[PDB]
Design a binder for these strands. Structure first.
Ligand SMILES: [K+]
Ligand SMILES: [K+]
Ligand SMILES: [K+]
Length: 41
RNA sequence: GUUCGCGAAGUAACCCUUCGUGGACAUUUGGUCAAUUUGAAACAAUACAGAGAUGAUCAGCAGUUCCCCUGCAUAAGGAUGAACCGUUUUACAAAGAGAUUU
């Protein structure tokens, strides 16, 4: 059977760059650690 | 409509009452959209068949895809979700030999 295959190339992000996205709100993307820390001097 | 001012009629004259007249106040809603067949939802129903790696029965996890579905979801599930299984000819040259032709 040929359904079991090694990867010839990985799926590129350029394909998704052209897609029109949806407005789903992900739990991990909710506001958190909203302020950046900076070093002295 | 209200109110400020003016003409007038009524009244003995004011108040008050009416007809006329000027100014002030208040100033542009709503539709991406019409009410059954012809601008688009799907399941279901009838039939047949009964799931990959196998001699046999099965757990799977992935990858690739201009297939996605369920789910709050970057989780998980959907037959390992499904499809995958076919078709495949030239960067075409070098050395040499024996036959063909003037
Ligand atoms: K079966
Ligand atoms: K399985
Ligand atoms: K699965």
């Amino acid at each position: 059977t040929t359904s079991h295959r090694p990867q010839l190339e990985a799926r590129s992000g350029a394909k998704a760059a052209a897609y029109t996205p949806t407005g789903i709100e992900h739990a991990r993307l909710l506001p958190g650690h909203t302020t950046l820390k900076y070093r002295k001097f």
